[PDB]
Amino acid sequence: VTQTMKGLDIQKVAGTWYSLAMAASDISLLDAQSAPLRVYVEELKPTPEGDLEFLLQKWENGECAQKKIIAEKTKIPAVFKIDALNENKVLVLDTDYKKYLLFCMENSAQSLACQCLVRTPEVDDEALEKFDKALKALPMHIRLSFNPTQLEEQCHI
């Protein structure tokens, strides 16, 4: 992934989002309702100090659970770090702040998952074209997209 957002203003990504579409390098990362990177964005919350908190939904042990994760800032405005047992990165690819945002999460070995976020529960063909433009430069093997009904449900049921 060598497409980041030039001139990103992190504070302007704040608020409500919908995961309209998702893609990953490996089928198993997104294949089931409880696959490990089948995570749905609810809200992005930039911090005063410049870190990026994600509020997420995920299907975990037979139900739709909530969870807050903090991605810490780097010297590069469009790149954040979630460092657990591995060093993983969050990259903001492109946004216009008021309609869409593209991001990826990636490991450091090679393995990758990206999403098209939108501000409202509708299919934005334009935002989806920019997503597919970004993805043709990456080795994705599975792609999912959601309908407006699903987008208004918990865990996109």
56 lines the binding site for a copy of itself (CB under 8 A): no
Q: Which of 97, 102, 79 is nearest to 23 (CA)?
A: 102
142 lines the binding site for a copy of itself (CB under 8 A): yes
59 lines the binding site for a copy of itself (CB under 8 A): no
Task: Please answer whether residues 100 and 118 qualify as being in contact, where contact means their C-beta atoms are separated by less than 8 angstroms.
Answer: yes
Residue 71: what are its φ and ψ, rounded to 5°? -100, 125
Residue 106's identity, in one-letter code, is: E
18 lines the binding site for a copy of itself (CB under 8 A): no
Instruction: Give the C-alpha separation, 116 to 147, whole Å.
Output: 13
137 lines the binding site for a copy of itself (CB under 8 A): no
Q: Indicate which single residue of 119, 143, 151, 155 sits in contact with a copy of itself (rule: CB under 8 A).
A: 143
Q: Indicate which single residue of 8, 56, 144, 151 sits in contact with a copy of itself (rule: CB under 8 A).
A: 144
Q: Pull the structure tokens for residue 153.
A: 């449900």
Task: Please answer whether residues 3 and 93 qualify as being in contact, where contact means their C-beta atoms are separated by less than 8 angstroms.
Answer: yes
Residue 30: what are its φ and ψ, rounded to 5°? -130, 5
Per-residue DSSP letter, 32: S
Letters for 105-124 (x = contact with a copy of itself by CB under 8 A, - = none) are --------------------
146 lines the binding site for a copy of itself (CB under 8 A): yes
Q: Indicate which single residue of 133, 141, 148, 149 sits in contact with a copy of itself (rule: CB under 8 A).
A: 141
Q: Indicate which single residue of 27, 69, 70, 137 sits in contact with a copy of itself (rule: CB under 8 A).
A: 27
Binding residues for a copy of itself, per CB under 8 A? 27, 31-33, 141-147
